[PDB]
């Protein structure tokens, strides 16, 4: 328990200006404004077509290995998916020398697409696949995940060895990479601020990282349209805002940096 206090964007810019090692922890909220709804019970969305108990779990993968591919294929094919202003904002915060890493539960790759340089993919990334017999790695790109691609023609996709391909994403019931976790833990151990943006922090991966940050007594700021499981438990502050409103923080800190003008 902690008495989390609400603050403004300008107050957040103020906090960041003093920091030397800022880390972000991100969830589906940051891709919300990239046309992937975060609320999975939304009936007017892709998630309505698909049973999460199947496509989202490792049991579901072995029973119906086509489904998570169909899901990835449909989101990729049916929606326009570009970096939003949150991403550009996080990208400038690294440029200005504040943001040192983004630890993410998202598998869409948008942080890197915006130019972030140390994105730790705790749940993996939809642009890689592995044969779940021989462990061969195949690199994919957006054009390969389209419904019209040859790679998508037969699902699940098949490996020359005879095994099938599985996306390189961590499903519910699977175990997060212990070398990636250690990377995320050493980032938090060295940070002087953790931004927890667009996540409920109810998945073990997030909850445990936030616990770790309290253990190492790091200052924790939520940026989210809502309070969350860690409000009044783990975060010191909360900015009530959409991820994309982070351009205001980036604009403040960018303006202030332009003190390169002699005088």
């Amino acid at each position: 328990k902690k008495d989390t206090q609400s603050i403004t964007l300008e107050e957040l810019a103020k906090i960041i200006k003093k920091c030397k090692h800022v880390v972000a922890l991100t969830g589906s909220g940051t891709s919300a404004e990239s046309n992937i709804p975060s609320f999975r019970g939304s009936s007017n969305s892709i998630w309505s077509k698909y049973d999460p108990r199947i496509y989202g779990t490792i049991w579901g993968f072995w029973k119906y290995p086509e489904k998570i591919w169909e899901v990835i294929r449909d989101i990729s094919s049916d929606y326009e998916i570009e970096i939003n202003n949150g991403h550009v904002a996080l990208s400038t915060l690294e440029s200005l020398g504040y943001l040192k890493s983004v630890v993410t539960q998202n598998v869409d790759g948008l942080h890197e697409a915006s130019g972030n340089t140390k994105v730790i993919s705790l749940h993996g990334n939809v642009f890689e696949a592995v044969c779940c017999t021989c462990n061969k790695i195949v690199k994919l790109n957006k054009i390969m995940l389209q419904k019209t691609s040859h790679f998508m023609h037969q699902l699940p996709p098949e490996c020359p060895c005879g095994g099938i391909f599985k996306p390189n994403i961590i499903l519910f019931g699977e175990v997060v990479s212990s070398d990636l976790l250690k990377e995320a833990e050493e980032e938090i151990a060295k940070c002087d601020l953790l931004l927890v943006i667009g996540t409920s922090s109810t998945v073990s991966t997030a909850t445990n990282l936030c616990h770790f940050a309290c253990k190492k007594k790091k200052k924790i700021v939520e940026i989210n349209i809502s309070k969350t499981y860690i409000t009044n438990k783990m975060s010191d502050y909360h900015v009530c805002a959409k991820f994309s409103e982070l351009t205001k923080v980036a604009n403040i800190l960018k303006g202030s940096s332009e003190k390169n003008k002699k005088i």
């Binding site: 961590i170 019931g173 997060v176 073990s204 991966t205």
Partner: peptide
């Protein structure tokens, strides 16, 4: 165990 779970 850093199992992904709700």
């Amino acid at each position: 165990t850093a199992r992904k779970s709700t």
